[PDB]
Every structure is written in structure tokens, then in C-alpha cells.
């Protein structure tokens, strides 16, 4: 059920719209917090597992043509 | 850094024989005995390794269901979680999970043909820091699972066999894509 | 007590209910490897279930001479006379 | 279990790396406070034991 991932990454995009450098850099590390957490490397991790799922899903249909 | 198709490697693994430590390598003789036998190499300065049969070539690597098509029919980097076709440096039999036993799990050994599931071996890293579809790296620890028997490659205590138990297996490079001409070690 | 044997029976039954997927049959043949369990369970005439699992397993996971070797339901046929009883119920489980 | 015990050794496989993470101020204060606290109350207790069998102390 993808609608939530839609809302969430639309969320993270909307946090950065208007070219907010300070907030993008904030996402990259958020310096003030006790634990740095890089949303970008997470997001890329998601994009990664998601292609992996897409590719396997391609091998489900790579033979099937139609 | 990256392992690739046609990157010759030995399957070394840790073993604390004699109260630590005996590093040792998988190495089927090929012509004469299909069964693999362990080949300790820790001695280095003492008895020299039989490295000539230790070696294996990664002739192919594929996604696990990418495998499951050509079977029903470029030096790409190994990714974790891909199945890969191991192949002996000498006899050039592909490595496989032989359907034999010595006391449940099957013996490992070479097979004449690239065909038929057993020759393939999926790579499952033990470290959680690594993830499926990440590029495999030099000297990284990793489990090898037979695609056919669904058994882990294993250091039974000592002889190799496929087993339900896991064992770590270093993919130590021997060589990559060496330049034309130019002598390298391990050549006759 | 015999409940461990009921566990092994439940297990071999659960593996008796499993048959791309050709390889898994080899995974189950890896555990016939049975055979002796049907003979030991017939010699121990409890009885119906343990062997029923072995037989369902032997049917699904697994030649006519070999079928001749599996003769022993005649034991159970002797058990049918025993009704004249818990063991009688067992025979029913064997007719299936 | 989960006690992956550590000892010093000549080699060590690659995932051995230990990336660092800062403790909170409050928490390390709490912990050092645990050291001072245990280190006072224990000797308090050992001092209580001295006269438990001896009818006749940090305080």
C-alpha cells in the first residue's frame, strides 16, 4: 500500500521545496541533535530496495511477454 | 575493491584447529576425485599451499530469479544476494553440491556442466552492515548457499560439505583482469 | 513420553504435505529415508497416527516391487480381527 | 543468547568497526553520578556491617 510512501516522500520533498539550503543541510545531519541521522542515505536505501523489488518483478515478467 | 565476473578467487575460511588458528582453502583436485578437500595455507613459511587447485573463477553472476529463467531456457560486479557460478581453475569443472553424503547434508564437489542449479551458489553476507544488492568487496566474509540443495557451503569438522549450518567464507582474490602479456604469479 | 514420537510424526506429516518446486522434493527426500518407521510402528501394535504420517509422507514425496516390499498393512488386517477397542479405531485410520 | 563477547586478538573480521556516538549530558552526568553513588553507599554498607556483630561510618 504505497499511498503512505507517496505522502512521506512528498513530505520530505515539500520540506525542501523553495530550494531551502539550510534545511537540506539540516536533513543531511541536523547538527544540533545528539544523534545525527541522514535522511538522504535512508531515502536512497529505499530507492534501492525498491529497484530491487522492481527488478525481481521484472524477472517475473521477463519471460512472460504479455 | 570489487569482485567481478572472471575474477579468480579462492574460497578461504577461518578454522581454529589446534586451539587457534588454521586458515584453510577449499580446493577440489578436479580430475580424479570430484569431491573437494580442504587445503590449509596458514603455514606460509612452512609447507607451501597447493594454490594451483585452490582457485576458482566466477564465470557468471545473476539475481536469484534471474537465475530462474536461463535454467528454464561484461565483468559485472558481484552483488550480495546474487547467485554465482563458481568454476575451477584447473579441471574447469564448475563447483556444485554433489548429491552424495558421508551424516545428512550433501557433499560438495565439482560437476562437469554449468547446467543444473547445484552449480550455482547464492551469496549471503553474514554482516548486517552489508545488504542485498550491494557490491561484494575484497576479503569480505560471506556465506555461500547452494541454489539446489538450499544448503550453506560448510566447514564440517574436517571436511567441506553442504550443510544446514552456515560457515563464513572469504572470497580472497587471486587475480582480476590481468593485462595481456605481463607475467603474473600462479602461472605455469 | 510418546509425545516426542507424536512430534516426529507431526513433522514427517507436515513434510508429507509438501510436493521450480521440484527441488524441494529433493529437500524432503533428504530427510525411502522413511521405510523402517512403518515397519517399527507396525511391530509396535499410539500406532495409527505415527505411521499415518509416514504413509502420507511416503505417498506424497514418493517402482512396483518396492510397493511389494511395503507389505505391513497385513499386520493392520490382523488388527481388524482385534475388534472382536482403541485399536479398532486404528484400523479405520488405516483404511484411509 | 545475545552476549557477543569481546577479547583482544591479532586479526579481526571487517565488521569489527565501532562508530562512535555521543552520550547526552544528562545521561553521562547520571552515570558518573551512579559511580559516586555506588561508591558511597557501598562503603556505607560495609561500615554498617562492622558493628552488626559488634555491640559497643560515613554519615
Curated annotation (Swiss-Prot), chain A:
Localisation: Sarcoplasmic reticulum membrane
Post-translational modification summary for this protein: The N-terminus is blocked.
Annotated binding of Ca(2+), by residue: 17
Domain of life: Eukaryota
Tissue: Detected in skeletal muscle (at protein level). Fast- or slow-twitch skeletal muscle.
Family of this protein: Belongs to the ryanodine receptor (TC 1.A.3.1) family. RYR1 subfamily.
Note: Binding of [3H]ryanodine indicates that the heterozygous channel is activated by Ca(2+) concentrations 4-fold lower than normal. Single-cell analysis of cotransfected cells shows a significantly increased resting cytoplasmic Ca(2+) level and a significantly reduced luminal Ca(2+) level.
Binding partners and assembly: Homotetramer. Can also form heterotetramers with RYR2. Identified in a complex composed of RYR1, PDE4D, PKA, FKBP1A and protein phosphatase 1 (PP1). Repeated very high-level exercise decreases interaction with PDE4D and protein phosphatase 1 (PP1). Interacts with CALM; CALM with bound calcium inhibits the RYR1 channel activity. Interacts with S100A1. Interacts with FKBP1A; this stabilizes the closed conformation of the channel. Interacts with CACNA1S; interaction with CACNA1S is important for activation of the RYR1 channel. Interacts with CACNB1.
Main function: Cytosolic calcium-activated calcium channel that mediates the release of Ca(2+) from the sarcoplasmic reticulum into the cytosol and thereby plays a key role in triggering muscle contraction following depolarization of T-tubules. Repeated very high-level exercise increases the open probability of the channel and leads to Ca(2+) leaking into the cytoplasm. Can also mediate the release of Ca(2+) from intracellular stores in neurons, and may thereby promote prolonged Ca(2+) signaling in the brain. Required for normal embryonic development of muscle fibers and skeletal muscle.
Domain remarks in the Swiss-Prot or TrEMBL record: The calcium release channel activity resides in the C-terminal region while the remaining part of the protein constitutes the 'foot' structure spanning the junctional gap between the sarcoplasmic reticulum (SR) and the T-tubule. Pore opening is mediated via the cytoplasmic calcium-binding domains that mediate a small rotation of the channel-forming transmembrane regions that then leads to channel opening.
The protein's name: Ryanodine receptor 1
Lineage: Eukaryota, Metazoa, Chordata, Craniata, Vertebrata
Gene: RYR1
Whole sequence portion shown: 3877 to 3942 of 5037
Amino acid at each position: 500500500d504505497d499511498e503512505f510512501t507517496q505522502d512521506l516522500f512528498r513530505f520530505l520533498q515539500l520540506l525542501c521545496e523553495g530550494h531551502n539550503n539550510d534545511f537540506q543541510n539540516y536533513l543531511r545531519t541536523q547538527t544540533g541533535n545528539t544523534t545525527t541521522i541522514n535522511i538522504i542515505i535512508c531515502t536512497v536505501d529505499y530507492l534501492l530496495r525498491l529497484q530491487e523489488s522492481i527488478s525481481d518483478f521484472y524477472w517475473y515478467y521477463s519471460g512472460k511477454d504479455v | 575493491q570489487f569482485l567481478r565476473t572472471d575474477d579468480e578467487v579462492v574460497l578461504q575460511c577461518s578454522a581454529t584447529v589446534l586451539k587457534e588458528q588454521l586458515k584453510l582453502c577449499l580446493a577440489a583436485e578436479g580430475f580424479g576425485n570430484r569431491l573437494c578437500f580442504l587445503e590449509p595455507t596458514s603455514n606460509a613459511q612452512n609447507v607451501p599451499p597447493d594454490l594451483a587447485i585452490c582457485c576458482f573463477t566466477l564465470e557468471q553472476s545473476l539475481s536469484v530469479r534471474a537465475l530462474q529463467e536461463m535454467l528454464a531456457n561484461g565483468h559485472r560486479t558481484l552483488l550480495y544476494g546474487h547467485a554465482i557460478l563458481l568454476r575451477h581453475a584447473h579441471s574447469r569443472m564448475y563447483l556444485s553440491c554433489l548429491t552424495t553424503s558421508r551424516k545428512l547434508a550433501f557433499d560438495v564437489g565439482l560437476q562437469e556442466d554449468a547446467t543444473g542449479e547445484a552449480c550455482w551458489w547464492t551469496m549471503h553476507p553474514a554482516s548486517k552492515q552489508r545488504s542485498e544488492g550491494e557490491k561484494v568487496r575484497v576479503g569480505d566474509d560471506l556465506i555461500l548457499v547452494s541454489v539446489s540443495s538450499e544448503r550453506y557451503l560448510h566447514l564440517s569438522t574436517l571436511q567441506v560439505d553442504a550443510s544446514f549450518m552456515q560457515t563464513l567464507w572469504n572470497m580472497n582474490p587471486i587475480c582480476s583482469c590481468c593485462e595481456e602479456g605481463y607475467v603474473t604469479g600462479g602461472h605455469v | 513420553g510418546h509425545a516426542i514420537m507424536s512430534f516426529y510424526a507431526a513433522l514427517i506429516d507436515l513434510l508429507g504435505r509438501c510436493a521450480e518446486a521440484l527441488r524441494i522434493r529433493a529437500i524432503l527426500r533428504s530427510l525411502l529415508d522413511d521405510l523402517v518407521g512403518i515397519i517399527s510402528l507396525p511391530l509396535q501394535i499410539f500406532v495409527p497416527d505415527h505411521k499415518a504420517s509416514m504413509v502420507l509422507f511416503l505417498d506424497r514425496v514418493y517402482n512396483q516391487d518396492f510397493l511389494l516390499h511395503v507389505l505391513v498393512g497385513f499386520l493392520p488386517d490382523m488388527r481388524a480381527a482385534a475388534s472382536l477397542t482403541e485399536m479398532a479405531l486404528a484400523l479405520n485410520r488405516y483404511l484411509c | 543468547v545475545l552476549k557477543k563477547k569481546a577479547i583482544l586478538h591479532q586479526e579481526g573480521h571487517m565488521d569489527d568497526a565501532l562508530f562512535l556516538t555521543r552520550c547526552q549530558q544528562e545521561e553521562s552526568q547520571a552515570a558518573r553520578m551512579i559511580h559516586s553513588t555506588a561508591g558511597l553507599y557501598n562503603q556505607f554498607i560495609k561500615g554498617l556491617d562492622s558493628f552488626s556483630g559488634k555491640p559497643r561510618l560515613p554519615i
